[PDB]
Amino acid sequence: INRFTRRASVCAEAYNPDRIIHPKTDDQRNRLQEACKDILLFKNLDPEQMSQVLDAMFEKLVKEGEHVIDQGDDGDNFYVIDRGTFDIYVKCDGVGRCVGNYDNRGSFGELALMYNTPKAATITATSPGALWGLDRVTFRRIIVKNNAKKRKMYESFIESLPFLKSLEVSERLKVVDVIGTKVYNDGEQIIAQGDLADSFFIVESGEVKITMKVEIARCFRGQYFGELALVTNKPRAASAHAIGTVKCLAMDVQAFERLLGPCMEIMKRN
Amino acid sequence: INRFTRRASVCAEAYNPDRIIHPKTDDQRNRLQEACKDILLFKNLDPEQMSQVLDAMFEKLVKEGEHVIDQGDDGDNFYVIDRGTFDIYVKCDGVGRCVGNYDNRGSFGELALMYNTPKAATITATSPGALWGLDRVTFRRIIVKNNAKKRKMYESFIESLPFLKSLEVSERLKVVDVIGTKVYNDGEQIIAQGDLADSFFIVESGEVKITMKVEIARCFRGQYFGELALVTNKPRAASAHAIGTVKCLAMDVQAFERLLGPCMEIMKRN
Amino acid sequence: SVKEFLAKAKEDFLKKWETPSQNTAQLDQFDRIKTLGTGSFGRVMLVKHKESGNHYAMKILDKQKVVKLKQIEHTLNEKRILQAVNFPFLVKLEFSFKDNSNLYMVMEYVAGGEMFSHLRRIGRFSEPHARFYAAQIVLTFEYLHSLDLIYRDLKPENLLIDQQGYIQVTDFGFAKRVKGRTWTLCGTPEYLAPEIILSKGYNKAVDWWALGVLIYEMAAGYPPFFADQPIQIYEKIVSGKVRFPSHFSSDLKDLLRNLLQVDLTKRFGNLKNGVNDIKNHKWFATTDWIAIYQRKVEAPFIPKFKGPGDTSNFDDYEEEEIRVSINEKCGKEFTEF
Amino acid sequence: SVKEFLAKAKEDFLKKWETPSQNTAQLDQFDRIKTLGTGSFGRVMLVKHKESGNHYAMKILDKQKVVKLKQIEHTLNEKRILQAVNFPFLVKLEFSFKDNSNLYMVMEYVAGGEMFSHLRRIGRFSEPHARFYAAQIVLTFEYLHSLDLIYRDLKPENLLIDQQGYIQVTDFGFAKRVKGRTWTLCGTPEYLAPEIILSKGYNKAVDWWALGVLIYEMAAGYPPFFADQPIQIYEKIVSGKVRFPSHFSSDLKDLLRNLLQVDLTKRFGNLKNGVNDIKNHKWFATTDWIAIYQRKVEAPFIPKFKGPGDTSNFDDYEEEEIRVSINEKCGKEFTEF
């Protein structure tokens, strides 16, 4: 065959980014996390987005024989099983058949978190059970609000940087799109003196200590280090080490020049 | 996916085997033959079945804009294009689309020659054209009547054979199922003296000459030769050669014993 | 002893075959409960015997539809064979009758569901599990074939699982008594032997081919020949070329090359030693054939069944009424039924 | 000169963008002839201008349905963008208007059909053929992007072939003016960029990704990311792992690895040299960019068209009436239209 079927357009509800906490036991929360770790939409989330998402999942109790969802019945909800047994049933022409079952674990409806998706199956509880549910509108907002926040500003980190002060708005956003994040535990070596200068760093949280073959700098939230990588490709003059648990933004200088050209060029404008 | 869809039973019309000639130019007949040579149902037919099948195909003229067949409209007919242009059109949900076209050649509906098969497409003539058609009932009868004839008897060839006279009916049919056929042109060596004795032969048509290191036998319709292969695995005592165009039944002796055991065993009964 | 057993089944079969049962019940004696199956030909209805409270699976055929399809003898074969045979792995016919519109065949109800359902839900059966089921078919074919009966519709859809997890073979629509060769193209596309496809005329060997397709489908979870277009499936069947899954054991593969043999001089079941080539084959080394026949072996799977008349092991179909016209239809065509 | 050309398109666009057209026709001035297309949102109707006899393709949107889907601004974006842009490969808006039930946009009729139809019928396009079409999109994106417009729905279904075999890009439902980053998940599953799927916020780079999907689909006959389940397609897109057909040229493959780049620091269209990385790329060595823009190059394919108003290059849809309620609906939501 059916190569002549057109691909339909899809579209979620508008939300312009420019509170909900459903309590759960620690164990429920661990199992919920573990069930979502390989699901496309969850697996790349940072710890803070994941945590808000789990916060927002609501409890759904079901009695034996209850329909958790019905075939063709709108997909605005994703579900993870907390406990209970369930039968999976599909009606096709035709004919209604039991196609499988869940035993105290499983999840379904993830496509609903992207756009409206009528369920392809009817799922029925075959014992008392419970599930964690999540809307699409609730999920979207959490993700979009959080990312819009990590931008605008992530920069203002970026724009407080002396070397980057002559960046235009659009060019700064290109850097915001891709700037990476790294986490370190107390006493990890972030930068080693004498090593290739591959990138620069901005401290998001925690404290970084700069030392040289001798303490020459202490770096707190909003401060950059390794920034000489932008203007010279000489070996690192200093080492850097995490004081406490440290989270840094990290930008590779090659990637930076692919997007924008040499930094000195931006610094010799007006 | 859809692994839960049952496989439906299929069944053609009963025909118990225990006239139609639609004239066509030599060229029409050659092109028709060439169009059917790789089609499953035709490709193994012997020359005489093929010839009767081609004999039986009827002429269908079509005017521009005429529907040759309609989607969902019963498949009891197979069609080969003799001449003309055609559009192929399928309606699916939904939507009607032109999915392709034929230009003075092509064929469709072969599954209909096995059992009722509603067509998956509507085919429309986009010029004056013509086709060769063939029913399923007409085709079946030709094939079944002919094979029933080549059996019952093919044996009576087999049962006129001294070594095989003690075969029971069912055992003779097992041999009829598998006995092969070979064709030779005037002066081809069928059997070479001194060679492995792999099988025996029955002349169906023509004339075979047996010679030895000297003419010792002439073999006509219904006569066997190489039959010593059944009772001894010594090298051929004589050569055999086709006089004219010769058609022989050919039975491999190993295959024979797989089915029935050693021939001497059958010959030492009662 | 297998000889003396079979010599005797034959004696018993011929006696019932000679004089068949007719009109041993009537529609108003049963309550219709639920549709159990439909297919290319009639359907099957869970029914309750009003008086005895016994449940049965009643097969229903519409006379006009059978007549239109030219299925008349198939229907007479099925009834006449079912009332004469008797074997542990064959669903039993209890009653048969007709009315103005329909033919009816009342079988014992087997509540475990079709092997198809279970096979599709689990995915595939382990070799010992598949082997348990195959052994029952092997013995059923031996029994049927010794009476010159061929079955012609082997497939998971047609094998019912009973309360002990044993097989009950069910739909005899295509079954036929053939002393020579027969010619009807019928069966199920995936399960058709080459000789049926090519109209060569054929007898017992097609069932053994189909046994190979079945075994392969149980152990793998899908049949050996498959494709987009049916004509494409036939092409593969006739080439008879088959790919095995990497998990198939060597003994399984060896058996399936001997069953799925396009060449009849090499197909197991069709050679000098007959069915013994299959029974003595090694994939069957650990099979106790008498024990299987006596249902003394332990089933690898028991169906979950609640009360009698429970239908949870069966799919759900559109329920349509049994219509009985005030006009008798095709009365002569079916006089023997 | 491309600079001085683009500096000027911008001047012209901003002037029309500032003050938009409203109610420049009405329904009773047209005869409805035939449905040309339907989709996730409204449809398209061949219509005949009663007086001029001119044919147009009239897009129809049901206000209530747009409101329910929360598509209101998309509809205002589409209209407001279409009346302000002007480029040879963009279908022109002639008239727009609304009534009690519907919004209407009357475009020039392009009679050659969707590239989808032709692509599916032939199978795939040769590289020079695919290259001809790609060059037009490249230039259209350059034009749109210089105005801060993104298109967001590139696919063969949305590209119409005109009488010269040139492309007319058509449905601006998802088009939007973005100076920063935007967040709506929309498009067509196969064509979605990673950043749309994962809600990272995104601007121009998604169109260049989609260009890579398109080119790949033209040259191969199927899109680079496909699967049973949509979620599975997304997984592949986000891995961004792609297999090329053995017949793809090395230059084609090199271009598609640069377009289908998950990493935005490496995606063509998004780097320092912008669109020039694509124009100067070698698969495009033999492309005369000014000549393409002037439609002086010779099309690899001319559609067969009989008389004006002929619809043979389009599929056939269920014809439904244009219903106009006696009650005005959602009048305020659409006041700007």
Side-chain angles (χ1 to χ4, degrees), chain B residues 139-155:
Chain B
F139 175 72
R140 270 314 149 199
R141 298 179 67 247
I142 295 174
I143 303 316
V144 162
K145 234 166 176 78
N146 196 264
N147 283 328
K149 183 178 179 180
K150 233 194 265 177
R151 320 168 164 267
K152 71 207 83 181
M153 283 168 259
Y154 243 168
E155 69 196 337

Side-chain angles (χ1 to χ4, degrees), chain D residues 53-121:
Chain D
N54 297 329
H55 295 281
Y56 299 103
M58 166 167 73
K59 191 181 175 168
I60 308 160
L61 295 145
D62 178 302
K63 303 191 251 169
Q64 299 197 118
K65 293 179 179 179
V66 171
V67 175
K68 180 159 188 192
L69 300 168
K70 309 245 166 51
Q71 311 277 82
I72 293 165
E73 295 302 320
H74 281 177
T75 297
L76 305 177
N77 295 328
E78 164 164 33
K79 190 255 182 153
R80 181 177 181 170
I81 296 171
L82 281 164
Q83 76 174 198
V85 295
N86 179 35
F87 199 69
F89 308 126
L90 296 184
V91 179
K92 270 167 166 45
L93 180 63
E94 304 290 9
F95 312 100
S96 78
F97 57 92
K98 57 195 184 182
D99 59 31
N100 281 335
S101 291
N102 311 311
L103 311 172
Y104 302 83
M105 300 176 77
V106 187
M107 329 291 176
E108 55 184 349
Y109 175 46
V110 182
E114 309 176 348
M115 171 199 293
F116 179 86
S117 295
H118 184 236
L119 174 53
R120 288 303 193 258
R121 258 161 93 177

